[PDB]
Paper text:
Catabolite control protein C ([name]) belongs to the LysR-type transcriptional regulator (LTTR) family, which regulates the transcription of genes encoding the tricarboxylic acid branch enzymes of the TCA cycle by responding to a pathway-specific metabolite, citrate. [name] widely exists in prokaryotes and is classified as belonging to the LysR-type transcriptional regulator (LTTR) family. Two [name] dimers interact with these sites for repression, resulting in bending of the DNA, and then blocking the access of RNA polymerase to the promoter, which results in repression of citB expression. IBD serves as a binding site of inducer and thus plays an important role in transcriptional activation by binding to inducers.
Finally, we obtained crystals for the IBD of BaCcpC and determined the crystal structure of BaCcpC-IBD in complex with citrate at 2.3 Å resolution using single-wavelength anomalous diffraction (SAD) phasing. The BaCcpC-IBD molecule is composed of two distinct regulatory domains: IBD-I (His90-Arg155 and Gly266-Gln289) and IBD-II (Asp168-Gly259). IBD-II has four β-sheets, which are surrounded by two α-helices and two 310 helices. Both the IBD-I and IBD-II subdomains adopt the typical α/β fold, which is connected by two crossover regions that form a hinge at central regions of two antiparallel β-strands (β4 and β9). Five BaCcpC-IBD molecules are in the asymmetric unit, and each molecule has an RMSD of 0.201–0.275 Å for the 144–180 Cα atoms, which emphasizes the similarity of their conformations. BaCcpC-IBD forms dimers with a head-to-tail arrangement in the asymmetric unit of its crystal structure, and both molecules have essentially the same overall structure. Superposition of two dimeric molecules in the asymmetric unit gives an RMSD of 0.327 Å for 321 Cα. The dimeric interface is stabilized by the main chain interactions Val122-Thr212* (2.82 Å, * denoting the partner molecule), Val122-Leu214* (2.92 Å), Leu124-Asp216* (2.80 Å), and Thr126-Asp216* (3.33 Å) between the β2 strand and β6 strand. The electron density corresponding to citrate molecules is found at the positively charged interface between IBD-I and IBD-II of BaCcpC-IBD. To distinguish between the terminal carboxyl groups, these were named pro-R and pro-S. The pro-R carboxyl group accepts a strong hydrogen bond from the backbone nitrogen atom of Ile100 (average distance for five molecules in the asymmetric unit: 3.12 Å). In addition, the pro-S carboxyl group also has hydrogen bonds from the side-chain NE atoms of Arg147 (2.93 Å) and Arg260 (2.80 Å). The central carboxyl group of citrate accepts hydrogen bonds from the backbone nitrogen atom of Ser129 (2.70 Å), the side-chain hydroxyl group, and Ser189 (2.59 Å) and Ser191 (2.89 Å).
Residue numbers in the entry:
A (entry chain A), B (entry chain C): 90 to 289
Amino acid sequence: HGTLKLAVASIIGQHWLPKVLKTYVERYPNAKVSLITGWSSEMLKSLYEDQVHIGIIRGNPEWKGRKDYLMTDHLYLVDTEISCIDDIAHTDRPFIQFKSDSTYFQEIQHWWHQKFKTSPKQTILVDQIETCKQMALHGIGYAILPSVTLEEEDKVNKMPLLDTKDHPIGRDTWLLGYEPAFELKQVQAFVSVIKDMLKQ
Amino acid sequence: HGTLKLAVASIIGQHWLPKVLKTYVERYPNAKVSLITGWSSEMLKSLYEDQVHIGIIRGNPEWKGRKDYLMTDHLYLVDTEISCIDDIAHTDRPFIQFKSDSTYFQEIQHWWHQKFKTSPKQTILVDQIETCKQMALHGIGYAILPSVTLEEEDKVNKMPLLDTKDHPIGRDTWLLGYEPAFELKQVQAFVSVIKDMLKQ
């Protein structure tokens, strides 16, 4: 029962993985866990280069190994004052806007263009989603966040992002590895903890 | 006015920078900000390669431009169960350790060797500090965090780390940047806002 090496997308590492690691540690005391985090592209690279056993990756990664769908969450435009999502096309509050090399940024641009037929205000550009949340909780402006980072208790208005046909805009999260990893007892225990937690 | 390109150490970007940025947007509407985060070394290296105007770096960075001391925070051990820091030399409760290329990790090994005359049991190694905090908040184990990441709303016991000679153990945060950037106007209004902030 050796060391489990994980490469996990940042918002997952922050918001979803802790509860999984709690159960993993509860069932397997003193099992060693090594965790790196970051952009999805970076964690995929790490997994591709044999540096970890398992990647948890968002988006739609192409992968010639084992790939398990985990979950989907949906985008919300959050703000402290604005209550109605149509006002966002006129307000003077800045668009705090996450941007990495994933498709998250492009897809919000596409939604904005289609819904409002205008372009959004490239004022504040941030390279990590959690800083967007924080900056938005502090009233600086509004933000578009995946619901995996939101809680009901968050003092901020929650406005569903819907496409032109009123369908919530989603993002997927996958678990990825090559066959040798899945033969390891600690990888298998971790996967088993995950596929337990998904039914909750 | 011009667009301010910041590089901030991750924990600063999340915990300290949002209030600094709120005031800066409050006094300067339509002023654009662009923010990359990460390890101090990575933001130092980016500042050196002219990608940003201003770096907010942690530790003791060597720098041959302008270096403004900013603040000092102190290391706290946190756990949901453990209330006395001497308990940890004897607990099967796991140790959640942040580790990067900065001195942070070896600083803590040194304090531990010098206080408990033993080595800490490495079970959980993670590569970003906020992930340590969350995993500590989730009761998984104890962590050692800088106070800038802590709040009283954080439902964990917080225990100050003191060296062999009764003294709290600190890390500093600086503000670096080459002379030209400080000529630029938005940099001056941001350096300003910071220093007028710090006056409580």
